[PDB]
Amino acid sequence: LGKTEVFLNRFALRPLNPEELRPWRLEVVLDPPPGREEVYPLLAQVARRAGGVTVRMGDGLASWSPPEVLVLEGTLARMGQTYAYRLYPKGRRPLDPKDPGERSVLSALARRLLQERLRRLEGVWVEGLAVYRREGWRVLGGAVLDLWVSDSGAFLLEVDPAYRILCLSLPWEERRRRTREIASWIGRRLGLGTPEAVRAQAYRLSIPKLMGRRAVSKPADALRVGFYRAQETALALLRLDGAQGWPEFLRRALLRAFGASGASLRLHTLHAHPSQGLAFREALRKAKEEGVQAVLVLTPPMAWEDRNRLKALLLREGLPSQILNVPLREEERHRWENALLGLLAKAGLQVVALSGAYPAELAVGFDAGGRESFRFGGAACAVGGDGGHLLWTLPEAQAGERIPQEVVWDLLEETLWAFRRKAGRLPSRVLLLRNGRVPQDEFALALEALAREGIAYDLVSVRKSGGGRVYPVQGRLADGLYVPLEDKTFLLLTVHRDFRGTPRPLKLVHEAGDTPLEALAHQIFHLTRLYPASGFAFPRLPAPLHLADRLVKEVGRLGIRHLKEVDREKLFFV
Amino acid sequence: LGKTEVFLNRFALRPLNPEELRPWRLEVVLDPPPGREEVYPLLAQVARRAGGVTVRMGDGLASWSPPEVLVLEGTLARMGQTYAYRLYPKGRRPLDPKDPGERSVLSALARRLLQERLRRLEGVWVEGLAVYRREVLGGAVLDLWVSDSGAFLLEVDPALPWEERRRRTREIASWIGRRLGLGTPEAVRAQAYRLSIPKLMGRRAVSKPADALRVGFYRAQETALALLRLDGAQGWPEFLRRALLRAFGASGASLRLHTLHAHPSQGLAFREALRKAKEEGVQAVLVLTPPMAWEDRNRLKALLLREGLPSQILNVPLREEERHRWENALLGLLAKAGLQVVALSGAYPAELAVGFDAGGRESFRFGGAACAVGGDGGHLLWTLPEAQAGERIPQEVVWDLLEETLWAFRRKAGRLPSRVLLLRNGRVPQDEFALALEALAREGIAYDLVSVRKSGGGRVYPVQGRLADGLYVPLEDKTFLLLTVHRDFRGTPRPLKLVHEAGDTPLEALAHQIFHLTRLYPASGFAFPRLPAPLHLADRLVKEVGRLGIRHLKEVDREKLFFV
DNA sequence: TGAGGTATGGTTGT
DNA sequence: ACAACCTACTACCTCG
DNA sequence: TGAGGTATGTAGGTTG
DNA sequence: ACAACCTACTACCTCG
Ligand SMILES: [Mg+2]
Ligand SMILES: [Mg+2]
Structure with a gap:
């Protein structure tokens, strides 16, 4: 247990100046007019050809560069069809960093500024948002970068060191140093001020x-x-x-x-x-x-x-x-x-x-697998409070990443039914886990059915990328770190080994339910230790998700036609 | 059997003249040159825009119109993008109706001639290959191709009691034949055999x-x-x-x-x-x-x-x-x-019959199989389908499904079947069954592969008397029509068209077992299905799984026909 | 969902 | 393109 | 197929 | 487009 502090691989830079807070608004006229489904990519393409720091804003354009230095008139090519664009300046729109709507537009401007400024950097290797700096084969050293705006109206730099093969893991501490060196080197050069590393309050979860x-x-x-x-x-x-x-x-x-x-x-x-x-x-x-x-x-x-x-x-x-x-x-x-x-x-x-005790006596994980033009949506579960049982259920064929509402519910009902076969009652609360993002309303039906059935719930999105990085302010880096960021969003360092490289915290979003975040973080962190088929190293994902990911992977590989006579308690895919 | 004779809804017209047998060949030059996906359809667009009666042949064009009355130079808007074409005449090449390739070209030219010549008729209603002649409106769908004996062949179908349809078919055949200057149409007869009543x-x-x-x-x-x-x-x-x-x-x-x-x-x-x-x-x-x-x-x-x-x-x-x-x-x-x-x-060559189909109407399908086990069809079973990208069932999937039906037979009968009847709904994609076919041969199981197409078989009318079902009509070698079901009050029947893809069972015996298999279906009390039971069950199996999902079937016995 | 066939946007393959 | 198959819903009538 | 995560580079997908 | 996730194979090292 205990409060502590960590650095994120993000760095506060200068406040947006008055100018930047009121970007130039430009309307776009295209000849011919695109259909309803093709216009947004086309606007984005127009945003590039205009040049300077310019992005799509709503149905038009926003630029931090005055319209005289933009290419206001020109031509584009998409899917065979050729368009002619003309950009009419339409004054400037005061963008506020609090209105997350506006901030998103400012962050888009910020990324474009960063990419653009980096292209003009002399004697350095640039690819998009990557820069390489340090060594007929070669090892290149550098970082993947990002830029957005804080709600107090200042530039935020995300920096993560990376190598480039032109013709490899880093101890955490080394990665941290190189992260700082590169953050200042770029901030001093970019003209965005001196970078100051961001701290966050972190909490040490109980050892499971x-x-x-x-x-x-x-x-x-x-x-x-x-x-x-x-x-x-x-x-x-x-x-x-x-x-x-x-x-x-x-x-x-x-x-x-x-x-x-x-x-x-x-x-x-x-x-x-x-x-x-x-x-x-x-x-x-x-x-x-x-x-x-x-x-x-x-x-x-x-x-x-x-x-x-x-x-x-x-x-x-x-x-x-x-x-x-x-x-x-x-x-x-x-x-x-x-x-x-x-x-x-x-x-x-x-x-x-x-x-140990946990809010939910049933935990279920949902994933989609298969590399073809169709996926399998599937679920795996841990039954009882102890995770006294690990089960899978038959996957379903689906068009893409979204799992259909009825399928989500059906899978869920099978796991509930497994709890009911194994315990003789319904669970009072369930922990629902989704690998990656939860598509809009994907769980809507299921969530409604649980309500109906008097079963409490929590929905948690578990992203394996996007969490960034976390470094201790002092001391050695240990796993079991919980880092609440905004409301309902938090990082969770579940696993770490000094020899493996630098840890990548999971990024979690509490989508539905009223279980306090710290409790969710406790049960999920603990769930990573339940996986039976890894003797000496714990998986980064909680066992329901790890199992589920393996399940849809194996079914993607073998087909679903072989599973009719395989017991749901036998974990054939480990 | 009893041998008999039927008319098909095809009509022999004039022999191709010595001129239609040596069509003009033309080379196509496009600017810019197309990627792989755009060249074959692009040649087809050029074929049409040149006008007259011209089709793709090989990597170029064939025309029964001289180059001098074609639009040899022009443009092609394709995917809004833009190609400029020039056609260079490169002398004619003799085509011969006996080769089946060189012939495929003559039939292509024939269809184009038909479609083209129909547009230029006045005052009738033309839609591609369909014409409507007065009365909404009443008319016929038409086709033209080339026989191997090198004569035009007309398919005519009004678009009815069978007798009526036949009559109208004849009327429209002659009305079209003279008008199109193809001569007087004479209806084709085929030898037909009457199958035993199951x-x-x-x-x-x-x-x-x-x-x-x-x-x-x-x-x-x-x-x-x-x-x-x-x-x-x-x-x-x-x-x-x-x-x-x-x-x-x-x-x-x-x-x-x-x-x-x-x-x-x-x-x-x-x-x-x-x-x-x-x-x-x-x-x-x-x-x-x-x-x-x-x-x-x-x-x-x-x-x-x-x-x-x-x-x-x-x-x-x-x-x-x-x-x-x-x-x-x-x-x-x-x-x-x-x-x-x-x-x-009865006695059938195969004591296991298995049908394969694909279903679902989404971006993916389900490939499934249903079977009739025992020589009497004494058992009807389904197997768990598999998700697949499209219509093609993967080789390993075909074999696995098949292995489950073999295994059903083994569990039921205590031995392996001597010979299986393998039925595919629709066409069999190239080598779809190759692995399964090899597996059976390695197990010492004899087999037959039969493609069953619900459309493409055309139509069959008796030369004399009433029309009855269980008509077997061999056409070329290995292909045949099979009229399995008919009633008067349903309209004119549509014979199945069947292709014997692999195996050496005589066609008549295949036709016998398949015809008989149409009567095994247990859930229709008063009317037999057109398809033999294994294919009818299989078609319904992939349909229901496409509807509900495959996730519900794990505890459902494979003897219980949940989809009927 | 009662069943049957006859009527009127997609996959393979070149 | 296009040839030749197919998917799946519908209404009609009648009940091997 | 021993397992885990961390790394690059494929080669690329879905959602909105 | 593109933002922000993801799929699944690979090699490395070491064994909560
Ligand atoms: Mg394994
Ligand atoms: Mg029924």
Whole structure:
């Protein structure tokens, strides 16, 4: 617990001058007139050809450059069709930084000023908003930049160091220094004053409590102390390498885990090979009939297509599988212990759970996956307060990133129904998580149905980009940092390792609900530690979202047609 | 068989003159030169703007008009952008109607000639290839192509009792032929074969599937059905209860009828009652409701489905004398509960038949399969569809769906089928079945691939007497028409057009099994579908999944025909 | 939703 | 473009 | 396919 | 357009 302070990778520069607060307003006339759907990009294009610092404002243009130095008359080309533009100055409109509407226009002007000013910088490498400065192959050093306006009417610089390959992670502290050096170097050159780094109040969240059969510090420990909830299991081994039976150290480790858990284990061997064709599927069917819940596949590294085909084939017989490549030595403990954890999660075992109290006893994550011209919208959930159960539900095919209102609700209803099957009652409050942005009204129906059903809720948008960066004012950088920014918007540093590079905090937006922000940050931060198939490192995303992202990715890869007979408690996609 | 003869709605006109056989070739020069996506359509626009009777041929142009009366130099506004074209005549090339490529060009020229010559008729109503001759207005749709014996061929279809349509077809054929200077049209005859009448079975022989309600079902098992009333009324209407009871008495199977005392208006508590019902054994639900809006219907269906309960809707008000409607609803209910209402009796080359279709009307589709297992079609099954970008079903998807129907046969019969009949709705895209075809060969399963096109088959009229269904008309090698269904009061029939894509089963045997398969469909009591049951089921499967979503089907048995 | 076929904006492929 | 298929809704009439 | 995040560079998408 | 998110593969290092 505790208040503390951090720097963001943003820097206050000079106040907008009186001039800039009243940008020049210009109307645009185009011949011929564009259709209703094509005009906005066209206005933007006009904004560029006019030159100087000019952006679209409403249906027209705003410029910080007087109209005499703009190119008021000229020509454009879009989708084959050629247009002729003329810009008529129409006085200047006083823009106030408080009216977030106006500020947005000022920030657009600010970015254009920055990009533009940077193009005129001598002996430096500029690409859009990137600048490279420090070294027939070469390493280039620099930063990605941004410029907007604070509501008190001053320039804000976001700076983040970056490299350029022309022919790579940075310790956090180094990145912080280079961030400052580059912020001043550019502010002094740009003519925007001396940069002063922005501070924010940060709060240190309580360390979450992870439980196997007993307390653990990492999920891999459940292999020695026992699982959070063990039950009678049967696992099968499929060897693609022509070898023996179970490697003894794998056997001994599984037996040890189950003995500590107080549950019984049956180990099977599949004496079949997929090159047998349909006979192979018969063996699977039999294996399944005999109780096998998941399969460990020992194989030389497989090509993606073979891997996918194999997974899909077992899946079609209701058998999740965990691959572990050979050659395999006993000393490669991390790899094979992670494999083992994978197998157990795919068998429907609860390896770890959290201890502690949280606002919501059901947490659900929503994502969309697939790289083709259609996506899958899907959900994964953590049931009970402890996250005592991890489930997935069948995805749905959709046109794009938006998940249809009815689909969101249906998925949600399945997870609620899972809670009701597992606890005998409805949850009093649910935590709804969305990977990335929530499209307008996407959750409207669902939200209404929960209300109707007497279930309290919170909606939280979780963005993996856009949060910027956070550095301690003093001391070492630790994860579990909560940084409230504006109202209902906050950063959350969930994971950090000194060797990984510099952390990227999540950016969260509280979209609906009245749970205090700090509480949401507490439960989400804690949720990152629930993921069972990573032994030694916690995911950045809370387990519902991490699982959901993996779910839609695997379904995107294998297809949805194989999942009919796969239990929703078996996490086949880890 | 009995051999016989039919007219097609095609008419032989004059042989191509020695001049039409050596069309002029022209080279096209465009400025600027187009990217890959714009060149073929751009040549087509140039073909039209040159005028006369000109078409794309290869990378250039062919005209039956000399270059001197074409607009050899001009411009093309395309996507508002702009190309300048010049055509350079490069002598003529002889074309021969026997090559099928060089011929494809002659037919293209023929269609253009037809369309062009029709525009220049006065005072009739022309729309592309359609003309309307007095009376709204009445007329015909026309086509022109080239036969391999190198003669023009006219398709004419008024745009009716079949006899009327035939008459009008003849009238319009001659009226057009002389007027267009193509000579006197003489209608084409084709040898047609009369297929054996399929033998449908319930508990015993039936002529229609609805008869299984009186004589008993092909295979009955102990069933439980539930009733959901959205109308605020009683219990089971008595006539429905008697009819069901009667059907199961005849079948020798026991029936248990339940009532759901829940309303969907109770939200989740309603889902609980569903779950409870399903545990107790309910297999399907009959829903008595006032007519529902599409969304409410979809939502309701999907909700029951999510608890693994297929549903049959029957609208109130309902009167006992509306026997067709409610008997059909009853047949639906039973198919959705997994009963085999009817099966065929006979010997077919393939003891597994599988249909493939794609559905959905959005930017993506669902590729799905439905099957008839056993030589009698003793089982009808669906498989979980897959999301895909367009009409093409991916090779691996085709094979996976197929493997599930094989596996259904293996679970039912305890062995692999000796030969399968693979049916594709619409055309088969290039190598769509290649992987599946190879897999079957590696498993020692014999196969046939048949493309089934609902349009393109044209029309068939008897030379003499009344028109009856189950007409097989071979055309070229491997292609054939199949008249599967007809009634007088529906209008003139539309033969299916079928292409034997892979396999060595004789065409007549394919036609036999396919024709017979049209009678297997259990949910239509009084009228057989045009498509054979595996394709009809499959078409309906991808339609319903395109409507509800695929997310509801995980707990729904693949023997329960929820989409009928 | 009762069912059937006959009537009147999209995908493949060159 | 365009050839040749297709999607899915509608109304009509009648009940293999 | 061992797992995580952090990095570049692909090659590029959806929402509004 | 473009702003601001995102998809999914890759290599690196190390093992809460
Ligand atoms: Mg994995
Ligand atoms: Mg029905």
